[PDB]
């Protein structure tokens, strides 16, 4: 019943600070152990990004990045999610025992993703992305798309309670469109598919600050979106600062449950 | 429209360190500094010996000053110096003269729920009744209705269950239309939200949770130890509520 805390484990070569000195399985294991200790329920491993202007890699390459890391941590007492939009990458990871496939394309890139996730009795996160030049209201477009994709997921045999929806904050959306989405999370929660909110250190949180910040300085306004989102009913949050959010979410979860209990 | 951040400045057993802490709190985003000389029985003179030197030093700063006192002699001395708010843990029950003193200086007063531990009626109803009665007393002394704050008094004269009832029903207190100051920071309630015997500082995140939660219920200020954490989080919640209003054409 708790809000799930999904930590971020980025394994793309370029995201590494010290020239990639610590871009290996052993470093990833130290990081994951820290995130588990701070309260992470899920570790989101990703080696690709669907953002425009990014590196375009092969399935073999993505597998090179993700497989060794997944194998090393899948045995830990934490759930494992993989950010991938290609079913071949998903299947290899599912065979290694991952729990969730976080598809930044909501199965739009590769429709086999649905039967692949279902074949392994896993969960799938469908993120709203693309169609940035849409002419209709973003939340309507988002709901139409995500609901069509979730329906495809159910057809493949994926249970409704194992199909997550993610607004895709940070992807194919203007500042106006993101403001609209953040104001209507209740509508997304109303679909009854568990909702994953992922705003951590992105432009939206960057612009909630009154000055230019380094990513880490956006942690408190990210926690604000976490608390707000839980109040709206989102079921999980994807964050960089696992501890802050884990402890804050424990508080909000407590307060909401206490409130429901006391109003029967 | 922003939620006001009231930073806590406990001065119970020197000015230099008090001023330093106030300097930090202003930086971290504090709108009000609440100076407290009675940890809660020291004499009025002893309370004044603690509080006064500090108030004399920080009252000229660009920040509102609140004094945590329930005795009118302490309040008056501070008000003469120019403080803005009297935060009364007894809601004027300890010293009936508190309201005349506050009225005299045209300052604000926070009426905190306290006492009557062996209450007859359910806590929320008893709280409302006591606080509204005291608000009435404050007004007939000449204090403007818009300068009266209500504080649920978390940490005082309530069992664990009663405080949980109060925290589950903040909207009913916010509904009185008097601005509400939520003061949970590091108190037993937050410790127990953590679920084990934590140190005071370890309760800062669950305290920030009561802050966000409280803002969503409409409280207008939060009294906190960790000013920076709550200031940034409160700022974020304020932005999200206003954005939600904007996109829906609410208010
Ligand atoms: K596992
Ligand atoms: K001042």
The reply to whether A21 belongs to the active site is no
Cα Rg of chain B (Å, integer): 17
Q: Which among A2, A202, A203, A247 is annotated as catalytic?
A: A202
Among chain B residues, the shortest Cα distance to A249 is held by B209
Q: Residue A33 has which token pair?
A: 């152990």
Q: Is A155 on the interface with B (CB under 8 A)?
A: no
With beta carbons less than 8 A apart as the criterion, state whether B5 and B208 touch: no
The 10 Å CB-count burial string (b at 16+, else e) for A82-94 is bbbbbbbbbbbbb
**What are the structure tokens assigned to A3, written together?**
């809000």
Helix (H, G, I), strand (E, B) or coil at B176: coil
Three-class secondary structure of residue B2 per DSSP: coil
- For residues A151 and A110, the answer to whether their CB atoms sit within 8 Å is no
How many Å lie between the centroid of ligand 1 and the Cα of residue A75? Answer: 5
Nearest neighbour of B167 by CB, restricted to A247, A250, A258: A258
Ligand nearest to the CA of B31: 2
Rg (alpha carbons) of chain A, rounded to whole number: 18
Q: How far is CA A95 from CA A2, A42, A90, B121, in A?
A: 28, 18, 9, 61
Residue with tokens 């004499």: B43
Q: Does A174 touch chain B (CB under 8 A)?
A: no
Closest listed residue to residue A238, CA positions, set A194, A208, A207: A194
Q: Which element (helix H / strand E) includes A197?
A: strand A196-197
The H or E element containing residue A231 is helix A219-232
User: Is there a contact between A139 and A184 (Cβ–Cβ < 8 Å)?
Assistant: yes
The whole-angstrom separation of Cα B15 and Cα B56 is: 9
Beta-bridge partner residues of A196: A236
- The domain defined by A1-264 folds into TIM Barrel (3.20.20)
What is the nearest CA distance from B188 to chain A, expressed in angstroms?
A: 14
CB A105 within 8 A of CB A130: yes
Q: Is A248 on the interface with B (CB under 8 A)?
A: yes
The string of DSSP codes covering A115-164 is HHHHHTT-EEEEE----TT--S-HHHHHHHHHHHHHHHHHHTT--GGGEE
Is-contact B109 B99, C-beta < 8 A? yes
CB distance B247–A179 less than 8 Å?
yes
Active site residue A31: no
CA-nearest of A234, A206, A202 to A49 is A202
Method: X-ray
The per-residue DSSP string of A58-90 comes to -HHHHHHHHHHHHHHHTTSSSEEEEE-S-HHHH
**Whole-angstrom distance, CA of residue B177 vs CA of residue B57:** 34
- Whether A184 sits inside 8 A of B233 (CB atoms) is no
B1-251 has CATH 3.90.1280.10 classification: no
Q: What is the resolution of this structure in A?
A: 2.2
Helix-strand-coil split of chain A, %, nearest 5: 45, 15, 40
| Most B-contacting residue of A140, A174, A220 (CB-CB within 10 A), to test interface | A220
Q: Are A248 and A223 in contact (CB under 8 A)?
A: yes
CB-CB contact of B224 with B8 (8 Å): yes
| Torsion angle, alpha carbons of B128, B129, B132, B134, to 10 | -120
Q: What residues of chain A lie within 8 A of the CB of B239, using their CB?
A: 208, 221, 224
Contacts of A255 in chain B (CB under 8 A): 167-168, 193, 209-210, 213
Choose the mutation target among A202, A210, A227, A232 for the interface with B, i.e. most B CBs under 10 Å.
A227
Is A14 annotated for ligand binding?
no
Query: b/e per residue, A101-130, with b = 16+ CB within 10 A?
Result: bbbbbbbbbbeebbbbbbbbebbbbbbbbb
């Amino acid at each position: 019943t708790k809000t799930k805390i999904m930590g971020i484990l980025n394994v793309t070569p370029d995201s590494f600070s010290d020239g990639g000195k610590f871009n290996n399985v052993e470093s990833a294991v130290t990081r994951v152990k820290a995130m588990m200790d701070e309260g992470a329920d899920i570790i989101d491993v990703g080696g690709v990004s669907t953002r425009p202007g990014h590196e375009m890699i092969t399935v073999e390459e993505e597998l090179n990045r993700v497989l060794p890391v997944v194998e090393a941590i899948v045995g830990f007492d934490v759930k494992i999610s993989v950010d991938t939009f290609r079913s071949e990458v998903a299947e290899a990871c599912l065979k290694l025992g991952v729990d969730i496939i976080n598809d930044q394309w909501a199965g739009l890139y590769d429709h086999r993703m649905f039967q692949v996730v279902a074949k392994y009795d896993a969960e799938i996160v469908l993120m709203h992305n693309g169609n940035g030049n849409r002419d209709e209201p973003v939340v309507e477009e988002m709901l139409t798309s995500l609901l069509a994709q979730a329906h495809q997921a159910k057809i493949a045999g994926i249970p409704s309670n194992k199909i997550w929806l993610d607004p895709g904050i940070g992807f194919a959306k203007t500042r106006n469109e993101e403001a609209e989405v953040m104001a209507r999370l209740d509508e997304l929660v109303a679909t009854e598919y568990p909702v994953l909110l992922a705003t951590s250190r992105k432009r939206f949180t960057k612009e909630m600050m009154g000055y230019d910040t380094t990513p880490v300085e956006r942690d408190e306004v990210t926690a604000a979106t976490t608390a707000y989102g839980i109040m709206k009913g989102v079921r999980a949050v994807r964050v960089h600062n696992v501890e802050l959010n884990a402890k804050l979410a424990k508080g909000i979860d407590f307060l909401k449950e206490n409130e429901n209990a006391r109003h029967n």
